[PDB]
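Model the whole thing, not chain by chain.
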Amino acid sequence: LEALEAMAKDNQPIPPRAMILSRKYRTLVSSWIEPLQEEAELGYEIDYIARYVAEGGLTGDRKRWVPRRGKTPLDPDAEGFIYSNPRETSFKQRCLEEWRLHHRKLLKTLHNEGPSILGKISESDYI
Amino acid sequence: DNKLESPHTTPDAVLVQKLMAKMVHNGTEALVMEASSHGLALGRCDKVDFDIAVFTNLTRDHLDFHGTEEEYRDAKAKLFARMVDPARHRKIVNIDDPNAAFFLAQGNPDVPIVTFAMENKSADVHPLKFQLSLFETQVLVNTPQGILEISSGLLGRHNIYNILAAVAVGIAVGAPLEDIVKGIEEVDAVPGRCELIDEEQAFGVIVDYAHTPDALSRLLDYVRELGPRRVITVFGCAGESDRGKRPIMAKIATDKSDVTILTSDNPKTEDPLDILDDMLAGVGWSMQDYLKHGENDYYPPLPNGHRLFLHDIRRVAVRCAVAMGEEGDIVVVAGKGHETYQIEGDKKEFFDDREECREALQYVDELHQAGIDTSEFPWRLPE
């Protein structure tokens, strides 16, 4: 949120690199949501043949997704990252994870510096 | 009876006339020159006096080549009117097709006209029988001019229409229906095109010639109307062909078939597993999704409930499809029909025939006796 906002103050357009996944649903705006890698329900069933014609049909190039031996990552997404793209996590999963740590630190302070504490009601509370 | 090898569908008119003259000189009593709509529009059969010029199915033919609809029908009508005799030319064609009536309207009116439509009452032809089967479909035709008995056709409506159209030509020569017994036997001989099931007691095997999307769709519809339990199909696309043809073909195949196998029918220097991915993209799947699912033992089905399989090599996949079939179910091979050439890259191999299907149907007994499971693509091998 902070970043996208920041760009605005500078009048620089979002670059073309934002791109659709095999499921066209993925886009920076919709990806962080919890259901992941799942085509969104539009009522009418997505026109599968229509998508094909759009990307490449009769003539043209489509990133046909067939696995190959050579070590170039299949996701076009990986390009530009030295080793690989970051692993996928939802806002939800991340939030639970972030949460545990802060707590852990308080517990950590407790583990080493915390057996003794200023409060006099501590003995009952420690348990 | 013999047929000379010709590269094109319609040979040269002068060469065809020379061969017909050589045959009529010794070894043949009649020289009938029969050509399709494209051959008739090119000028192969046009430069020959045709005694009987009838159309089996009149529709939009050579629309992209000639540039105008009903061009082949008009050319055939003109060729028939060039050399026409009274009460000698036959106009037997389905009355439902308007191009057939348009072609029959042109030419000499003294020529005999007749209709082979089953639903039409003016044609007086009707099946009037319920004996449709994968092995033989006999009908009791009740017409004043047509013969009583009909030929056993593999298809429900296409073969029935062909038999009804041939009954008129058979009765024109001889009014007695006993002479059409040989024609009915030859029609039931299961020719290369729209072949019937094998005579051996096994699962039905139908070898068809379906490459264009519309023909594939109509053959799939006829098989669904004929197929009692399952519709198992296996086919592939040719290299350097219409790229937009693969996804629509895959969609039309998966829309009405429970389980389909996708292979490489004609690699022809095109990289494998590439056009296969193009066909897989029609149902929205990618070869990566399948391959990473293949490491497991689940293989999730399609959202509509159907199943889809694929394999690179053609022989093993065809043998599996012939083995993965129910008793009442029939296996359809629409990849190639009368063709006996598989061009895998620069070299071509002639390893596509019905003898392989017969060997597979013979050895499936030993496979079942060994304990192998051929219900789905991941065969359950004991230990």
